[PDB]
């Protein structure tokens, strides 16, 4: 099964930099959101949870077709809260309808890292919407009650390595979890991508919690949490050593993760080799907007 990427027609940089500044305009005025954390984490989880369905095995889910547009997808337990990111996007889908269901998502989160003050992520144009029947079934995102090993079987279904998911899951810095959405409550407020999951992971002191939902979370008296899945990655020693790296090296913990954010959201994607090369978006402060 093969998604060859195809560019809406006649669209360049330019274009695309219209519809980032939108969102990243947005992003600026609607600060409310979730007691004042803003739109960002939302945008970044949503890119990430289109992405996440991808099998590589035979290139059903990923990004390509915007499937999340379906009920059977948007309705997905696990992705209780989304609907908050997908109400964001439409003013934007409207005034620019010609940008495809695929590009929009996961450009949204590139927009939501970069002016987060994030790494630069390159982007590339032109997932195609496809049919209702090409929306994958639920079940495909992860368990956060799991260990390193469920955590580590999970991401080879996405053709991620141990490096690859350390640095995904160090967008854990943003944003919150939320009792009604996911089971979990708690986890601060932050909209800065910084490299403070893998700091908070080594330097707080974890008590092992039941939450008001009756699952175990791991809370720390500064108010941070981390999932069980989270708490995984400094009890697998393999894990343990890439998160002491990137809690020591901003810049490296930046790049990889900008690596391997590109290849989640472009995962099941055959670009022709004429495609345009990928665009690094200005953010609104590099362009004085
Ligand atoms: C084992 C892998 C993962 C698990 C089990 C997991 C699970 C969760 C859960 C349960 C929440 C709370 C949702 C809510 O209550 O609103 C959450 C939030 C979040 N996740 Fe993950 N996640 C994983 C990987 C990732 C990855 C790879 C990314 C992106 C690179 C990501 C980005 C986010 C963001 C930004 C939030 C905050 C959302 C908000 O503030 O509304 N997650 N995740």
Redesign the pocket.
């Known amino acids: 099964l093969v998604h060859v990427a195809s560019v809406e027609k006649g669209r360049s940089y330019e274009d695309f930099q219209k519809v980032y500044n939108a969102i990243a305009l947005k992003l600026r005025e609607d600060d409310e959101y ?1 007691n004042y ?1 803003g739109y960002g ?2 945008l ?2 949503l ?2 949870h289109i992405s ?1 369905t991808w099998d590589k095995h035979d290139n059903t889910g990923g990004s390509y077709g915007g499937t999340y547009r379906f009920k059977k997808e948007f309705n997905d337990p696990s992705n ?2 989304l609907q ?2 997908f109400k964001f996007l439409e003013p934007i889908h409207k005034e620019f309808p010609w940008i495809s269901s695929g590009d929009l998502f996961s450009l949204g ?1 590139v927009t939501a890292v970069q002016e987060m003050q994030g790494p630069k992520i390159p982007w590339r144009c032109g997932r195609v919407d496809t049919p209702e029947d090409t929306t994958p079934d639920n079940g495909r ?4 009650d ?1 260990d390193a090993g ?2 580590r079987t ?2 080879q279904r996405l053709n991620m390595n141990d490096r690859e ?1 350390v640095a ?5 810095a ?12 708690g ?1 601060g407020a932050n909209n800065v991508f910084t490299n403070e999951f893998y700091l908070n992971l080594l330097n707080e002191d974890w008590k092992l919690e039941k939450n008001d939902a009756n699952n175990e979370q791991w809370d720390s008296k500064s108010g941070y949490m981390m ?1 069980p ?2 708490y995984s990655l400094i009890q697998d020693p393999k894990y343990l050593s890439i998160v002491k790296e990137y809690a020591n090296d901003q810049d490296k913990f930046f790049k990889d ?1 900008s690596k ?2 590109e290849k ?1 959201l472009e995962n099941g994607i055959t670009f022709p080799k004429d495609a345009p090369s990928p665009f690094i978006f200005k953010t609104l402060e590099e362009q004085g907007l």
């Not at 995102?141 to 956060?144: E, R």
């Open positions: 979730d954390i984490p939302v970044v989880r890119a990430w996440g209780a809260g908050n990111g989160g995102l992860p368990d956060a799991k469920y955590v999970f991401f998911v995904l899951m160090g967008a854990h943003l944003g919150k979890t939320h009792l009604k959405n996911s089971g979990y409550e986890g999932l899945t989270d993760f391997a954010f989640l």
